[PDB]
Amino acid sequence: ELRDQQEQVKEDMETKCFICGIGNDYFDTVPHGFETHTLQEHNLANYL
Amino acid sequence: AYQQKLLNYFARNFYNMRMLALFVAFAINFILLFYKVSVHYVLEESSGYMEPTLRILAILHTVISFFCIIGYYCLKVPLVIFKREKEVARKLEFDGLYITEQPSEDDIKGQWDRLVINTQSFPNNYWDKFVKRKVMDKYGEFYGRDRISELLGSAVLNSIDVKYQMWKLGVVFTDNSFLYLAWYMTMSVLGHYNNFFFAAHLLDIAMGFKTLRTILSSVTHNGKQLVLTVGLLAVVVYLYTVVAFNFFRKFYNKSEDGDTPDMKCDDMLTCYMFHMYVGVRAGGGIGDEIEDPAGDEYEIYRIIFDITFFFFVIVILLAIIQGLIIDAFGELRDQQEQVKEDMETKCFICGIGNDYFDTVPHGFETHTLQEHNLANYLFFLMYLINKDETEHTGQESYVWKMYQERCWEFFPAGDCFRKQYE
Amino acid sequence: TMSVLGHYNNFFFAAHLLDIAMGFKTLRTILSSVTHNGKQLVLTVGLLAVVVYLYTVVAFNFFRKFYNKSEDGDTPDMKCDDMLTCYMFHMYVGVRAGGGIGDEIEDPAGDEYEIYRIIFDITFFFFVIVILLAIIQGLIIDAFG
Amino acid sequence: VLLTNLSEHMPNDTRLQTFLELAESVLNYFQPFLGRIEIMGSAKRIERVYFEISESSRTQWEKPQVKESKRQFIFDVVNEGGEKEKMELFVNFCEDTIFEMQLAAQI
Ligand SMILES: Nc1ncnc2c1ncn2[C@@H]1O[C@H](COP(=O)(O)OP(=O)(O)OP(=O)(O)O)[C@@H](O)[C@H]1O
Ligand SMILES: Nc1ncnc2c1ncn2[C@@H]1O[C@H](COP(=O)(O)OP(=O)(O)OP(=O)(O)O)[C@@H](O)[C@H]1O
Ligand SMILES: Cn1c(=O)c2c(ncn2C)n(C)c1=O
Ligand SMILES: [Ca+2]
Ligand SMILES: [Zn+2]
Ligand SMILES: [Zn+2]
What we know:
binds caffeine; cryo-EM; 4 chains; binds zinc ion; binds calcium ion; binds adenosine-5'-triphosphate; membrane protein; part of a larger assembly
């Protein structure tokens, strides 16, 4: 269960935004889009 | 050229040669099962000349190992040197890493190739022998035409690129499979010297039966976890060695009855190796191979020490190591099964699914016998390369243009043909 | 034919206990679970035999002065040095041992080869009793799952 | 190819259908030899290509070593990879598989 929690953290840190919480697939119709969706769009450091 | 004709015979017949070398190694260690202390010598529940056949098969096996390393050197080494040349040639053009970007002292495998730039056969296998002037005229405007273009630049002995050949061997030697076969050749040689450790060729049952290969990959999947856990176990054993040293050294007699010349093991440099060899693989913890209390002062502390050793070594930590290895097996077989699953419910390219191509009966199999069927992109790309430029259609020139552009939008993302229409 | 050849000799007329498997429909799943993973289990057992054979090579070539089943050795001492012998020794004794090999063998008490001996002991313990028996167990319980 | 293209692009028409039924014996020879893939040719919709498969290329592709290179590639890509860089890995595979294909022809 502990390793499953570690892996689930490192999973939903890569198929969701933390904020708009949508998903990976919707930001992949555009190529490379989800990475831009957290290099420009929400990118949690910028709210800070 | 008959040398080259004989060279064709090797690489045409590589895998069967390697499998037959495994068969020879089985036969030789079958023979070497029969040994006897006397100097060593073999009897015979066999024909009279089994020792001359051992003398035959040692030479025979070393012949087959040398034979197959020649076949492998002239089989797959051109492909590996091709992939290396292509990667380096693209990183000269699209990056200029020896010109602008300057990779650091890190990544020596990416830093080996600095002394192959000015080699004249850098496009040996790249189908593009004009990379030189291309990157010259794309960049040598700025960083000096002269310096950049200079940086790009017995008769058969006088007609080979020596420095390039050195670089070629330098990329040959770093390879895994080449290192493996060279090791295998040297072990057949040093079993030809001493046939005692000629039995080390049993390792090929792993490298070559493709499920034992998963077994042997499962010993190194969880490396940093397993090494840290074994170090943790050593720390626990060392701490109990500290306790046993400082409080319980009067329980150490391997000897019988102690009036016989009694031996102890309470030393820090001894008690430790005692608990390692004895207490770890014990099964009964430590209370088997040690004195037991029978009404001492320290009886209760002794039983506490015994039970805590039992729990925090044999109950938990051995199960941790076992569970880590069986976890690695579960994940490896799950990856094998996931490959063979999503090779059958998705297209690799349009990536849609199985169910959508099953409204029509038998449809998904036709959706990868006609529609995408990955071999045909390979074939069609060969078709584009091999035709002349001037006879492309609109789509053929379009795809050729995109491929020269390297931008990759013509592969359908989620848009098979049948989806487009009703 | 087994009822006939128990009618002849009723010693092995007891072989008809096999029908509890073929006929209670959960033991049938149990007995199908011995042959589900055939090629994996046979290859793994062959791998274990290869590891045992390689350690037989090492024990032959460097450590045969530790083989006395006899009491005190002045009694007519028996060794297990022969390649074919040491091999069947590690099979019958070392595999089902549980303590690896260091129980049913001489122990070092200040020899030259003491450290090499303990390395040999620990590596036998790990690469047989820790891992491979658990591999076989896990393969069977995986087939049941 | 042209009868094929009229059939595939324009189905449900009985006249071409009858004609193709009278044209059956040629396609059955050439069905192994033509291939047909999907792209998007700048029109922002799905186009279809037809092309030609050389005999020796196919019949020396499918046997020797390239099956294992294929396995290796499929294994490495389906196990792991970024979602958009997979196709560039495929073209890298396609490129050196073509080189290997010529080299296996060279034997
Ligand atoms: N809302 C979000 N905020 C931040 N990252 C997100 C978000 N949604 C998805 N991600 C993904 O999570 C990853 C965050 O990276 P990460 O948190 O590892 O930062 P790092 O600097 O790489 O390492 P560290 O974890 O030490 O900060 C990014 O790769 C990004 O793709
Ligand atoms: N895009 C795709 N390309 C190829 N095959 C696909 C694709 N999508 C689904 N498949 C399915 O994957 C399977 C590929 O078969 P496979 O790769 O095993 O070829 P093979 O010749 O049977 O064996 P090998 O693996 O040695 O090539 C086919 O049965 C096909 O149904
Ligand atoms: C000539 N040539 C090419 O032009 C080529 C290629 N692969 C891609 N291209 C573009 N190969 C293998 C090739 O031989
Ligand atoms: Ca034209
Ligand atoms: Zn968001
Ligand atoms: Zn597709």
